[PDB]
């Protein structure tokens, strides 16, 4: 009802102060997808939060 669970398809290294770095296979909760391209996400694996490139993730159980 607000859960938006995605899995990282590849690694992504942060390159701004607001990006989230993640490893392939991490599960993420999508907090805000307002921008369309870059989504605010929270890692279920690491507990870190930040923007992610939406093309690097796919919906997951």
């Amino acid at each position: 009802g607000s859960h938006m669970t995605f899995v990282a398809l590849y690694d992504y290294e942060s390159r701004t102060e607001t990006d989230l770095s993640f490893k392939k296979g991490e599960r993420l909760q999508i907090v805000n997808n307002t921008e369309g391209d870059w989504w605010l996400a929270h890692s279920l694996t690491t507990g870190q939060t930040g923007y992610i490139p939406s093309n690097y993730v796919a919906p997951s159980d």
Binding site: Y12, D37, W38, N55, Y56
Partner: peptide
């Protein structure tokens, strides 16, 4: 804009 990165 901020383009998305290319995919590996």
């Amino acid at each position: 804009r901020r383009p998305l990165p290319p995919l590996p």
